[PDB]
Design a protein around this ligand. Structure first.
Ligand SMILES: [Ar]
Ligand SMILES: [Ar]
Ligand SMILES: [Cl-]
Ligand SMILES: [Cl-]
Length: 162
């Protein structure tokens, strides 16, 4: 297992524009298009992203290409964030993938807001971190996914995904 497989399980794959858990227009493997309530606006953003007149539909390869860029951007966003980078560098491989999933889902910004959890992960206090991470809107709104990511940080293994 790895980051790609992990996120492919959490996000799914859809080839037509859809609304995510927050009601935002998305396509592919969790590629958010826009926070706007306009379907047209989402179609405009999709065309621009792909570089062709898609009409709300893409191929598997295009979805996978967006996905690669989004993983890459997430990692780079972590590395560029003063609050995140040090946490990240302190973690082992498995846990790093848990950190990436979270940023992919909620943005750098969002993640950089779990100050307390961040600190406990940096100190390797796994159980305490797991409990603090669960005290969040993230967990209350997408409890199944959150539990998988949380178990990942807790144990450092991929059992939640196997
Ligand atoms: Ar992180
Ligand atoms: Ar975190
Ligand atoms: Cl894009
Ligand atoms: Cl969920």
């Amino acid at each position: 297992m790895n980051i790609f497989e992990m996120l492919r399980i959490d996000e799914g794959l859809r080839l037509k524009i859809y609304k995510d858990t927050e009601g935002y227009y998305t396509i592919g493997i969790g590629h958010l298009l826009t926070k706007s309530p306009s379907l047209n606006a989402a179609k405009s953003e999709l065309d621009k992203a792909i570089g062709r007149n898609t009409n709300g539909v893409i191929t598997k390869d295009e979805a996978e290409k967006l996905f690669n860029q989004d993983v890459d951007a997430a990692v780079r966003g972590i590395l560029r964030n003063a609050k995140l980078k040090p946490v990240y560098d302190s973690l082992d491989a498995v846990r790093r993938a848990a950190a990436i999933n979270m940023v992919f889902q909620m943005g750098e910004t969002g993640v950089a807001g779990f100050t307390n959890s961040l600190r406990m992960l940096q100190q390797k206090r796994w159980d305490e971190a797991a409990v603090n991470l669960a005290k969040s809107r993230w967990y209350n709104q997408t409890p199944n996914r959150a539990k998988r990511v949380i178990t990942t940080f807790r144990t450092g293994t991929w059992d939640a995904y196997k």
